[PDB]
């Protein structure tokens, strides 16, 4: 019965909320530039772009 109590208490100490969201692999933070050049190029694929102008 004593161990039965101990498991209860252990369960109570793990039912509490996390202080924070957990860390992960934030490593190799992604570039924005290549994404732009790729999207803009593919969208302009086989297209004769002629600048912008106002």
């Amino acid at each position: 019965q004593l161990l039965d109590v101990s498991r209860q208490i252990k369960s109570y100490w793990l039912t509490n909320s996390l202080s924070t969201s957990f860390p992960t692999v934030d490593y190799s933070e992604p570039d924005l530039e290549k994404v732009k050049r790729t999207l803009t190029k593919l969208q302009n694929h086989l297209l004769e772009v002629s600048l912008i102008e106002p």
Binding site: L3, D4, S6, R7
Partner: protein, 54 residues
């Protein structure tokens, strides 16, 4: 007494009450010993009874 062409001494009350008490308590001892070492307890999992199949 003559128990129909038969003779039996009159039993003492305490001897046979205690006799039946003996028989009962013996059945109780056997009742305990057969099931001892069988409730495979685990706090995590209750009173498991290991089996060949479910």
């Amino acid at each position: 007494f003559v128990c129909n062409e038969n003779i039996y001494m009159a039993p003492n009350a305490y001897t046979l009450l205690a006799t039946r008490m003996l028989n009962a308590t013996y059945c109780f001892q056997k009742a305990l010993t057969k099931i001892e070492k069988f409730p495979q307890y685990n706090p995590q999992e209750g009173y498991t009874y290991p089996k060949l199949s479910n």
